[PDB]
Structure formats: structure tokens, C-alpha cells
From a paper:
Bacteria have two well-conserved topo2As, DNA gyrase and topoisomerase IV (topo IV), which allow for dual targeting by antibacterials, affording reduced spontaneous resistance. DNA gyrase consists of two subunits, GyrA and GyrB, and functions as an A2B2 tetramer, as does topo IV, which consists of ParC and ParE subunits. Topo2As regulate DNA topology by creating a four base-pair-staggered double-stranded break (DSB) in one DNA duplex, passing another DNA duplex through this break and then resealing the break. As part of a structure-based approach to develop novel bacterial topo2A pharmacophores, we co-crystallized and determined structures of DNA-cleavage complexes of the S. aureus B27-A56(GKdel) fusion truncate (gyraseCORE) with QPT-1, etoposide and moxifloxacin.
With etoposide and moxifloxacin, we solved 2.80 and 2.95 Å DNA-cleavage complex structures in a P21 unit cell with two complexes in the asymmetric unit. In the 2.95-Å S. aureus moxifloxacin structure the critical interactions via the water–ion bridge with GyrA Ser84 and Glu88 are similar to those we described with a Gram-negative topo IV6. The primary interaction of fluoroquinolones with the protein is via a water–metal ion bridge to two conserved residues on GyrA (Ser84 and Glu88 in S. aureus GyrA); these two residues are the most commonly mutated in clinical isolates resistant to fluoroquinolones. The four cleavage complexes (two QPT-1 and two moxifloxacin complexes) not in the CRsym or Casym clusters have a range of configurations (angles between two subunits at DNA gate of 177.5–178.9°) intermediate between those of the two clusters. Furthermore, these intermediate complexes have buried areas between those observed for the CRsym and Casym clusters (1,203–1,526 Å2, purple structures in Supplementary Fig. 7). The two S. aureus gyrase complexes with two etoposides bound (BA_BA'2–etop and BA_BA'2–etop) were both in the half-open Casym conformation. In contrast, S. aureus gyrase complexes with two QPT-1 or two moxifloxacins molecules bound can have relatively large areas buried between the two subunits at the DNA gate (1,203–1,526 Å2 in Fig. 6g), suggesting that with two QPT-1 or moxifloxacin molecules the DNA gate can close more completely (more stably) than with two etoposides bound (this might be because etoposide is less flat and keeps the −1 and +1 bases further apart). Consistent with the different stabilities of inhibitor complexes observed at the DNA gate, QPT-1 and moxifloxacin were more potent than etoposide in DNA gyrase enzyme assays. Furthermore, our study reveals the binding pocket of QPT-1 overlays with moxifloxacin affording opportunities for scaffold hopping.
Author numbering:
A (entry chain D): 414 to 545, 580 to 637
B (entry chain C), C (entry chain A): 10 to 490
D (entry chain B): 415 to 545, 580 to 639
The structure:
DNA sequence: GAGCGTATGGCCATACGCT
DNA sequence: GAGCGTATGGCCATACGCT
């Protein structure tokens, strides 16, 4: 449990939730400012692999991706089982900065291409930490707890899929291999 | 509450992409800097870490820049600063480093606890006139400090030191250039606004790398200057020494820009091992401080060194291409610019910096002239001024009485009240008259600059020539026909 | 050249050993600090990182302290600073930290890029009067800065926060204490120089840990106070609660000082799995912030919890000894000091601080009164003074003429020449007389302190009582009889 | 890297090895050296005190192993001076108190495991500029011109004169008996 | 048994675009 | 291809003395 995960005491997935925090420093304080019985911290280190740019052999060889699959215990692709899930709430916790947004996009790319019925079942959530420039690491153990660790005070955004044919085009454009379509999107939307 | 997956993807990705583009990876066309570099240089400036003063510990520079301007990792700041101090990375280094700052072999710098730095004499030209309302200041990340949006950049830094950055949806790759050549091109542009890229190339021959070496043909350069995009073939300086008994050897004295020497040697060494190249008996790195780069390749007796060398150019980084992609931030937005556009935008920045400076200098001159008029009235009627003050119960009454009796302004009255008794000596009264008279000529001189766009343009030219004569150096990279 | 192996061993080892002793591992008897701590606190002070202002980034504090005073690793500075901000390490914390600064479970603080700090309100008392020639300043490692040899330490810090250091040939282990108890002991010593350790112990009952808990007997304490060396038995606060119909549980609320909570739990868990302790059904760390330390040991039915608990004290760090070895730098040399010696040396430092302050304050007061006398002569004869200045060609002549005519000093004449015209108003002339008269009364007040050693001793007592009333708190550790 | 950087020459009589204190110094040394006759072995952290350790620990210490592999002489009873790869073994530490400590620790290992290397006069001490800054805060140009260039450098040849006295010295200073060490400090005080 | 606290930082993986 | 350059830091071993 030093750089790896710290799990929830409850064996029931309806009661328990997993928080994918951003950075080492965020992982430590979130492991301290949690409800050990219901809350499980998986600290993610560095930028997570863009699955839309990578081939399967590389995706499965990644230890960041492998840690998540082992934590949810759902399986990937065609062997994904919504019922065989360890948690009912998968919370993306990231810095309130531009790189925090980036990590959030990379995680959703993996979940959309490999664990699609997890998002459809409304299991995927986005934690809402205070915006003001500081970021997760700079926060104290008790500030971290009353900010987003109490599902009382906390405000989570339920990730929902409304148009799968539009989402497919969106992930392939933003996270794909073709720069020109990405460059166009930036040029147009600024 | 809820959140659409497509909306979050589109919104979050655009936020990151735009930030990497306008505030990370791409340089500003005007000063040629990425935010991290600008923050390091401004931090050096604010802390007075100038060339005349002693070297200051790297960890102190990094910690200051971080706490005041750059809300990121200490390593990312230290590493950016390190590059700026490397004579093989920067054509005109912006940081003056003491200690292990790395080498060409891919050898990193020492940890920031060892090493110390200060700014180079050329960097003072990037910061010249910054405190004369020449550039716009902005609030920092936390709002407790002010920082420059752009530096005055009294020399064309974007083209001089070049740029290399990987953004999102785009990237930049601008090669370094000769300062004497660039400034001459800038001077030729100011005199002729309809100057062709061909005409500019009579001054700016092409890229000039700090690592020297050779460029193969003007073709690659020409395309990169006309379109802002092109491939420039960089080749190592290698000589074949004819030795006794027919025997030969190749000596590499200059290697391509951004090419890792040790990695290049490793690539040659692996081809020999793998039998992918035939004829090399021995390979050595004879590089010393006394000689510079010296990579010696021994050739077998029955082999042709000219054949081996040409195959080395093809199969190893002994010859490497430079993929020019001139993208810079023009009006806070990314743009693929050609050579002329880079120079035009730079010349406009200089026109603005010099105008803004002259405008500032004038306000201050007019302000001072006014105070001097007040002090002149005061000194001319000193016996009266003294009695007026002495008769006054408070400073407020003294202020009113002086303004009402001697027809002085609030500022003139306050200046007289702040006047020290030592300003009443013989020489000190004479100094005031001399200052006022010299000031009136300076006001006229400044007013003439703002009145005529040609006088202002000529001043820019004069100041640019001064920098060219002081910092301009010989061309390092040889462009072969 | 040549060099004997024995000579090289003796010379080099002594150099290291003496440096570790006098400039690394051991605290000064006067301020209770190791050089690294003193440098962090002085660095905070110089940078104005006081409690009233915002938290400043840890990397900026570390880089400043390193570049200016501490020529060592950034980690060793950051880590020393971190401990000073920990309410479980320091009995009266010297640093005010924001972010992850570690916990009792042994986990460290976040990297310096994520943390922020400033000084605590008590640290201002360590630095109080530093700029009033109370302490001696020395040149730093490079000679470009000045740093304090010792801080004024207006509260007994060595005994307050304690010390723990591993030197060469020796080590130190001083436990923390109660400020109210210490100051009272200091006051009792100042009134009675021949006070026994027994008599002092009526005020200073023993160590007071930030982690609270219990001390077993006064025996261990008495030996440590008389000789400087002794073993003090520390025991956790544990209660046996009557939960179930027959079921019972052990609750640990306070653990021994410097004991790692997670390690202690692991040791208990290990005995249970190895069957070396029978009776424990479950063990859990229910510790939270509002909850504090809460280690729950649930006891199996029909098993005696009183038996299990006593066996836990013996077999785990739930009960741990504190090996007191009171070694501090006294006159720049290491010394094993007893309780009285620690207090005597501290009281002498306070006597010197307060005397030196009063002496400084007096010099400045006498200096100002002198200038005021000059300005008083000037204002009383301004018509003449103005005349004298006006008749003078240079500042040099005005200076001489004023000194010769109005029997003024070089300083008085210079002050008059630097006098602004606004000082000639009615009210401004009256302010000078009021300042002079109040100043003469302050000079007399100061002169009285330096004239009587008892008045000076009483002032030290008065100022020590002020700190006791402001920062003194309730005893945390319970000493069981 | 952090590993040994050998010299091109295969003749040990002209070959020298510089045991450099720290990574950052080791890089500049490798850049400023004479590639033909000078090898650099960067020694990271405080070297294990062999006087306080047992054999299983000594042989398991990587920095000790790196040195043995570099000299290629062997240790204890199997030390062969004829198998030495360098005729000059230069101890190059910082001009500070910790540099002195590392110098003592290295001499303790050499005295207890490679004694005939010191006897043959193969062990030397580099004399860098004592100007308060350490090795890692020095340029590659000046590290050569002051501490490595044979034309200007000053090396101290480590000599054995009294083996009975040296044995008592290593035992006192580096031994497990603290009291004798504490006595040495309190006697040799000021110096 | 082993660990207290000041001392002596390179390695590793990922995004991003071009060639 | 793989690596250019700004972005998202814990792990490891040693000295030293005491108990
Ligand atoms: C490379 O040396 C260190 C090691 N190494 C020692 C061993 C020897 C060979 C390589 N591997 C291991 C790890 C380590 F484990 C930790 C630290 C350390 O914490 C530290 C600091 O400033 O805090 C500084 N240094 C350097 C100043 C010595 C450390
Ligand atoms: C722990 O994350 C990092 C890795 N790790 C990524 C992998 C994932 C799991 C653990 N092992 C590897 C190594 C790495 F290789 C390098 C850096 C790095 O250079 C850096 C910096 O400020 O310079 C900061 N970070 C942290 C801010 C991210 C790095
Ligand atoms: C009772 O003290 C010792 C203990 N521990 C007992 C305590 C329990 C909790 C954590 N540690 C402390 C220390 C220990 F772990 C090791 C040693 C030890 O190796 C040693 C030696 O001569 O090498 C000497 N003694 C002293 C008896 C002379 C040790
Ligand atoms: Mg962040
Ligand atoms: Mg890094
Ligand atoms: Mg090639
Ligand atoms: Mg460390
Ligand atoms: Mg016990
Ligand atoms: Mg050093
Ligand atoms: Mg033992």
C-alpha cells in the first residue's frame, strides 16, 4: 500500500466507492482523510496512457491501466461484466487545473473504449474540488475530507452517455492519431 | 448533478490544449520565449541577479520563480534554466552558469543544490527598458504579484536562439540564427517594407547553429523561409586524413545541432557490431576541453574512407535533418509564420517598445520640469517662501499659503516643503538652473521623436546597430553550395 | 607530495567529528537550536514570513536558507523545517505549516513543491530584539551574508521543545517540557541562585510531551535532573471499556513520545498472528482529527483485559523508555548538563540579551537627543542658519560654518542641512520639543536599568512572566506517583 | 552513468583512477579528465565503515563491490598487486568536513582489505581548491586545471610508516568503542 | 532486535507533434 | 523509428550513538 491502492473494508459494492486521485501527495492525504470502511483510494501517478493512440499489446502492458482493471475486477472489452464490479461509484479526482482536465480526458478515453457499460450504468463520477489555483497536493488532510471525501458536503458529477455515435466521433477526433482534425477543432472552437 | 460525457470531453480537452498552446509549449513572436523562460529571466531581473553581481545558488532562483510566478515543478524550472546556460543549446546563451551544466554527450546538469547562475550580458538587452512602461504587466497565478506579458527584447531573440516545443494539435521548430545577420535583415526591412524573402536572404543566409557544422544547400532554407516549413540537412564536419601505408581515418570535429554525441557514437558502434557497416577497425571519442569535439573513425587498408563516411551520413545521426515548423504566438494566438512575418512582428514590437519608452520618459521629464519651475520660483523669492512657511501653523496651511501667494501648484508647493536646507547652498541653486535647461532640450528631443515616425524608426535602427556591434559574432555553420 | 596514513586519519576524522558536534547534531544551550533550525527561523524572519502575513511556498524558504546560510541538501533543510511544524514532534511548534506535514503513523510530509509555511507566534519570541545588538552576528559560509550565532530566545526553548541528535563520540536526548513550569523554575532560580534540583522540581515536575500520555514514577526524572542522564518510563493512555454483555475493549488514546503508531500497531498484530499474545479478537486504528489517537483492541470473552494490557506494555512500544542524555553546546563546546545548569545558562543568556538591548536602546536615544538638540538650536536661530547656508558656496563650507558659528557637531550640522522646509511650521517646531523631553525621560529610565543589576534582573522576570501568561499551557503528560 | 568510466589505455603504469565524491562531481570529472590515462569511479553517499561491519555486509555493499571490480586486485588474502588496473588510485572528495569523513572511510577499507595497495604507494589524495564550495559546484575546465592535470595538480601519496600505530589508529577512530573516540575528540579539541 | 534525526540525488513512465 | 522539450516525485543505502 505505499504507492499502490488502499481498499475499503466493506465487501458489498453498493456501499463502497473508489477514488482515482491525481498524484502521490494527493494519494497520501486522501488515504488519511477517508472513511476506510466505504472509501478506497487508487493513486494515479503521472499522465495516464492515451488508449486511443495505443495498440492493445501496449495498453495491457501498462501498469497504470492494469492497476485499475484489477481494482474494479470487471474485465475489459468483450469480457466486461457490469455485475462483476467491486465498486458502485468510480470517482475521478483530479487537480482543478488544465493538466487535471487532461488526466480526466485520458481516463474517460480508457473507460469509453474498454469499460463502456460502467459509464452507461452511471458508476463513473467526477469529484468537484475547490477551483482556486492550489490543486489536490497543496490541500490538508481535513480540508481534503470536508471538500470532496464527505458524500454529504461533496458534489459529484455523474458521467452520462447521450449519443454514442457522436461520442465515438468525439473520442476519435480529440484523442486519435490524426493531428489535422484536432488542429481544426482547436482552430474552430478556440 | 449530472454531466454529459461528450461535453466534458470537448470542454476539458479544449481547456488543456489551449493552455499548452498559449501558456506552455509555444514561444511569443515578440520576445521568443515560453512562459517558463520569461519567468526565469524576470525572476533573475527582480532579484538583481545581473552579470556585475556574484553567482546566486540555482535552488534560490528556482524557488523564487516557482513561489512568485511559475506554479509547477522545481525540476521543470531548473531544467528550462539549465538549457539557457548551455553554449551548445542556446546560440546566444541567456543564463550564465557556474558548475556542472551538462555537456553534448547527453550528460545532465548537477542537481540545483550544486550549481549557481546569474543573467548573461545579452539578457540585459531582453530586459532593457522593462520598467519604462514599454511592456504590459499582468497579475500572477495567485494575484499577490505582477509579471511581464512579454519582455522588451531589444534583439530578435525568437530567430537568434530559435524555439522547439510540442503543443496539442501543433508543434514548433525554429532554428537558431546569427545576430549580425538578423539585425542586418531587420535594418533592411525597416528601410524597405516590400522586401522579398530572397532579398532578406542576402543578410540572413540561413540558420546558424551553436554546434556549428554544415548545411547542405540553400534549397531547404529557402522553402523554410518562404512558407515557415522546410527540411534543412545538417551534416557533421568530417575530414579524411591520408596516412602512411595507404591507410586512412575520419575525424569528426563538429556534429549536428541537438544531436547527442554519445548516442551518435553508440549508433556507429552498434552498426559495426551488427555488421550493418563494413570497413571500421576502431572508433574513439578523443574529445577534450583543449580540442573540442574529436570523434576518430579508423578505416581498414583495403577499404575506401569516402564510401564509409557517406554511408555513415545516411545510416547514423552524423547527418540529421532539421524539420522547420515556424509556429509562434502572434496576438496571443498560434500562427505558422514565414521569415519576413517573424521579422515584421519583431520590428513592430521594437517600434512600440521605443515609442512607449519615449512617451514614459516625456511624462516624467514634463513632471520634473514642472517641479524645477516651482523650486526656481522658491529660490528666487526664498526670504518670502521661508516667512510664509514659518507663519503657517500646519503643513496644510503652508501648502495653501504657498499656492495662493506664489501662484504655485499643489505638486510645486509640496516639492518646496520637501526641499532640504542644503539645496540653498551656492552650487545647489546653480544645479537646479542647469537641470531645468538640459531638461527643456531633452523634452524637445523626445517631442521630435513622437512627432516624426521616421525619427522614431531611425532611433530603433541606431539602437539595433549598437546591439549588433556589441554582441554580433562570426557565422558558425557553413552553408555549402 | 607525501602524507602519513595515521596523520591523515587523525586530522580528517577530528575535522568531521568536531564539525558534527559544534555545527550539526548538537543544540546550543542558550536557544536550544541546531544550526539548520536556527537558519530556517532566521531565514523566515529576514524574508518577513511572520504569522500576520500569508503562507509562503516551502521551496522558496528552503532555497533561500540554502543559498544564504545552509550549504547542504534541500531535503535535509525541508525535513528539519517539517518537524518544527509537527504538533506531535514539537511541544511548542516553531513553524506554521499548510498541507501534508506528515502524521504520527510515520508517513512523511508532501514534497516541498506542495507545501507552504510561515513562523508561529511563539517563534517571534525566539527572534524578539534580534536587531537590537542583543546577539552576535557572524559571516556565512561564502562571506556574502551575515547570520546569528544564537537567537535571543525570550523563552527557554532547549527545555521547552527538547532536543535529539546523534553526533560523533556523543549524542543528546533532552525531553520536552511545560513552558509554565519552566518559566516558573527560571523565576525561582533568579530569586534564589543556590536553589536545589529538588526545590526546582516543585516548579518543573518533569518532561511534558506533545503526545501527552503518562510517566511512571518521579525516580527516573530525579536522576535525569541531578546528573543529566536517566531513563524515564513512558506509558500509553489506555482504558478498558465495558461494551457487551460480557465483552470488553481496550482503547489507546495517547501513545508514547517519538513512538511510531503504525509500527506499534504492526508489533501488536505480529504477536497476535504468532500467538505470543492470546485474547485479542480484533485490532483497529480508529484515529481521526476530531477523534485524535484511537487504537481499539477488542478482548475475547472470559479473557482478562487487565492481563492483556499489562502484557502489551511489556511486549510492545505501548510502554517505551526515554533515555535522557542532556548534552548541549555551552561556550561552543559539548557538555553534559543537569537541570539547574540548563536553567542557569539560559538565565545568563536572558540577562545578556536584556542588558545588550537596553545598552543599544540607550546609544540610539542619546544619538537622537543629540540631533534634536541640534535641530532645537537651528529652529531657535533659523534666520541666521538660513543666512549661513545661503552664504556658503558648497555643502562642505555650510557644514564648517554651521559648526564654527553655532557650536554644533558634524552630525548636528549634517542633520540641519538635511532638514526639510516643512519642519519650520508651527506644529512641527512643537513636535521636536515634545520628542526631546520624552526622550530625556526614556534615557533616565534606561540608565536606571543599567545602574542597578536587580532592576535589570526584575525586567527579565517581568518579560518572562509576560511570555508565560501568553503562551504557557496546561500539562499534557500525567506523572503517576 | 553512475558506474565506472574507464580510460582507453591498457598499461596500468600510466593509468589513474579518480574515486569522485557524488554523482554531480562525477559527471564534470568525466568531462574534464584525460580520456587516455584517467578513469572516474563516482562514489555515492557515505562509504560503509568496514571496521564496524561484518564480511557478509562488506561484500554485499555495492559501492565497495564497484571499487574491487575496478581495481581487479581482490580482497584480503587473495589481493594481488600484479593484477592492479591503475598504479594511481586517487581519493577525490569535497574540500569540506564530510569530504574528510568519506576520505577516512575509504582509507579504512583500503587498510583492512587492500593493505599492499597503500604500501606500494598506489593510494593518493587529490588536493582541490579549498574555496568553501564543493566538487559539484565546480566547472569541468577548473576541475582539470587544479585537481586532475599532472602539470598543476598536487596529490598526497598515502604512506605507511608504523603498522602497529596505524592498527591502533583505525581501531580507535573507526571502531565500535565510542569512549576512545570521544577521548580523542576531547584531547585533540581545537585543532 | 532497531530506529531516532541531520548529513552524503539519479531512475523510472506518461501526453503532445513531427520526421 | 525514437527523441526532441515543458508538463504530471518516491525509492534506495550509508555514518553516527544510544538504549
Ligand atoms: C545517491 O545517494 C543516495 C542514496 N543512494 C545510496 C545508495 C548508493 C548507490 C546508489 N543507490 C543507493 C541509494 C539514497 F538511498 C538516498 C539519498 C538521499 O536521501 C539524499 C538526500 O539528499 O536526502 C542524497 N543522496 C545522495 C547524496 C548521497 C542519496
Ligand atoms: C512519480 O511520477 C513520475 C514518474 N513515474 C511515472 C511512473 C508511474 C508510477 C511510478 N513509476 C513511474 C515513474 C517518472 F518517471 C518521472 C517523474 C518526473 O520526472 C517528475 C518531475 O517533476 O520531474 C514528476 N513525476 C511525478 C509528478 C508525476 C514523475
Ligand atoms: C534494549 O535496547 C536495545 C533495543 N531496543 C529495545 C527498545 C524497543 C523498541 C525499539 N527499540 C528500543 C531499543 C534494540 F532494538 C537493539 C539493541 C541492540 O542492538 C544493542 C547492541 O549492542 O547492538 C543494544 N541494545 C541496548 C541494550 C543495550 C539494544
Ligand atoms: Mg496541478
Ligand atoms: Mg522529471
Ligand atoms: Mg542521417
Ligand atoms: Mg534523503
Ligand atoms: Mg515496552
Ligand atoms: Mg560537500
Ligand atoms: Mg545490536
Amino acid at each position: 500500500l505505499p504507492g499502490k491502492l488502499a481498499d475499503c473494508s466493506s465487501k458489498s459494492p453498493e456501499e463502497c466507492e473508489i477514488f482515482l486521485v491525481e498524484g502521490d501527495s494527493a494519494g497520501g492525504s486522501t488515504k488519511s482523510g477517508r472513511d476506510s470502511r466505504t472509501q478506497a483510494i487508487l493513486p494515479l501517478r503521472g499522465k495516464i496512457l492515451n488508449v486511443e493512440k495505443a495498440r492493445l499489446d501496449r495498453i495491457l502492458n501498462n501498469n497504470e491501466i492494469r492497476q485499475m482493471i484489477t481494482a474494479f475486477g470487471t474485465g475489459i472489452g468483450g469480457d466486461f461484466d457490469l455485475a462483476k464490479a467491486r465498486y458502485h461509484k468510480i470517482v475521478i479526482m483530479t487537480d482543478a487545473d488544465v493538466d487535471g482536465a487532461h488526466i480526466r480526458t485520458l481516463l474517460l478515453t480508457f473507460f469509453y473504449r474498454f469499460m463502456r457499460p460502467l459509464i452507461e450504468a452511471g458508476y463513473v463520477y467526477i469529484a468537484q474540488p475547490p477551483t482556486g489555483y492550489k490543486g489536490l497536493g497543496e490541500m490538508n488532510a481535513d480540508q481534503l475530507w470536508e471538500t470532496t471525501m464527505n458524500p454529504e458536503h461533496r458534489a459529484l458529477l455523474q458521467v452520462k452517455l447521450e449519443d454514442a455515435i457522436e461520442a465515438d466521433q468525439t473520442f476519435e477526433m480529440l484523442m486519435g492519431d490524426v493531428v489535422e482534425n484536432r488542429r481544426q477543432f482547436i482552430e474552430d472552437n478556440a | 448533478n449530472e454531466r454529459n460525457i461528450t461535453s466534458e470531453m470537448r470542454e476539458s480537452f479544449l481547456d488543456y490544449a489551449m493552455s499548452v498552446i498559449v501558456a506552455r509549449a509555444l514561444p511569443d513572436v515578440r520576445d521568443g520565449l515560453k512562459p517558463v523562460h520569461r519567468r526565469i529571466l524576470y525572476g533573475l531581473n527582480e532579484q538583481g541577479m545581473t552579470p556585475d553581481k556574484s553567482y546566486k545558488k540555482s535552488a534560490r532562483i528556482v524557488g523564487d520563480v516557482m513561489g512568485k510566478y511559475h506554479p509547477h515543478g522545481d525540476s521543470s524550472i531548473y531544467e528550462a534554466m539549465v538549457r539557457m546556460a548551455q553554449d551548445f543549446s542556446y546560440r546566444y546563451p541567456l543564463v550564465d552558469g557556474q558548475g556542472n551544466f551538462g555537456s553534448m554527450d547527453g550528460d545532465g546538469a548537477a542537481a540545483m543544490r550544486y550549481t549557481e547562475a546569474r543573467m548573461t550580458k545579452i539578457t540585459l538587452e531582453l530586459l532593457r527598458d522593462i520598467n519604462k512602461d514599454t511592456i504590459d504587466f499582468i497579475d500572477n497565478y495567485d494575484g499577490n504579484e505582477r509579471e511581464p506579458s512579454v519582455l522588451p527584447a531589444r534583439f530578435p531573440n525568437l530567430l537568434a536562439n530559435g524555439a522547439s516545443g510540442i503543443a496539442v494539435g501543433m508543434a514548433t521548430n525554429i532554428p537558431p540564427h546569427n545576430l549580425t545577420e538578423l539585425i542586418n535583415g531587420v535594418l533592411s526591412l525597416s528601410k524597405n517594407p516590400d522586401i522579398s524573402i530572397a532579398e532578406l536572404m542576402e543578410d540572413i543566409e540561413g540558420p546558424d547553429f551553436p554546434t556549428a557544422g554544415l548545411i547542405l544547400g540553400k534549397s531547404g532554407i529557402r522553402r523554410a523561409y518562404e512558407t515557415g516549413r522546410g527540411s534543412i540537412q545538417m551534416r557533421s564536419r568530417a575530414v579524411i586524413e591520408e596516412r602512411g601505408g595507404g591507410r586512412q581515418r575520419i575525424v569528426v570535429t563538429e556534429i549536428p545541432f541537438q544531436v547527442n554525441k554519445a548516442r551518435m557514437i553508440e549508433k556507429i558502434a552498434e552498426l559495426v557490431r551488427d555488421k550493418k557497416i563494413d570497413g571500421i577497425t576502431d572508433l574513439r571519442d578523443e574529445t577534450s576541453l583543449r580540442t573540442g569535439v574529436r570523434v576518430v573513425i579508423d578505416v581498414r587498408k583495403d577499404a575506401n574512407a569516402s564510401v564509409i563516411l557517406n554511408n555513415l551520413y545516411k545510416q547514423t545521426p552524423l547527418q540529421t535533418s532539421f524539420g522547420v515548423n515556424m509556429i509562434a504566438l502572434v496576438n496571443g494566438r498560434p500562427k505558422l509564420i514565414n521569415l519576413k512575418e517573424a521579422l515584421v512582428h519583431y520590428l513592430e514590437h521594437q517600434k512600440t517598445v521605443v515609442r512607449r519608452r519615449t512617451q514614459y520618459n516625456l511624462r516624467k521629464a514634463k513632471d520634473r520640469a514642472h517641479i524645477l519651475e516651482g523650486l526656481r520660483i522658491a529660490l528666487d523669492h526664498i526670504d518670502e517662501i521661508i516667512s510664509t512657511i514659518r507663519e503657517s501653523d500646519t503643513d496644510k496651511v503652508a501648502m495653501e499659503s504657498l499656492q495662493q501667494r506664489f501662484k504655485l501648484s499643489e505638486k510645486q508647493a509640496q516639492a518646496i516643503l520637501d526641499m532640504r536646507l542644503r539645496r540653498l547652498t551656492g552650487l545647489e541653486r546653480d544645479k537646479i538652473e542647469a537641470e531645468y535647461n538640459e531638461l527643456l532640450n531633452y523634452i524637445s528631443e523626445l517631442e521630435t521623436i513622437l512627432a516624426d515616425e521616421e525619427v522614431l524608426l531611425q532611433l530603433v535602427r541606431d539602437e539595433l546597430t549598437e546591439i549588433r556591434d556589441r554582441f554580433g559574432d562570426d557565422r558558425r555553420t557553413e552553408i555549402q553550395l
